[PDB]
Design a binder for these strands. Sequence first.
DNA 1: CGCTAAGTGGTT
DNA 2: AACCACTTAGCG
Length: 61
Amino acid sequence: PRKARTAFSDHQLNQLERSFERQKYLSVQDRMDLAAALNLTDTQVKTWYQNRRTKWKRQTA
DNA sequence: CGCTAAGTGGTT
DNA sequence: AACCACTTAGCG
């Protein structure tokens, strides 16, 4: 079974985008800290970072 | 549809 | 274990 697609809250997307604008990569500890602060799993944040770096490369052209 | 979350297969 | 490059697929 695929895992169900996460629907991020406004709060979670806002903080994820702010984190990404500051740092394109996070250390393990920063990734875990951000996940905890946003009530997300480590994997949800890791996955969001990774997909966000894909978008960042597309838009940098 | 537009945007993007999760899965695959491979690289680092 | 995390990333990459791409693929599959859900939801506003």
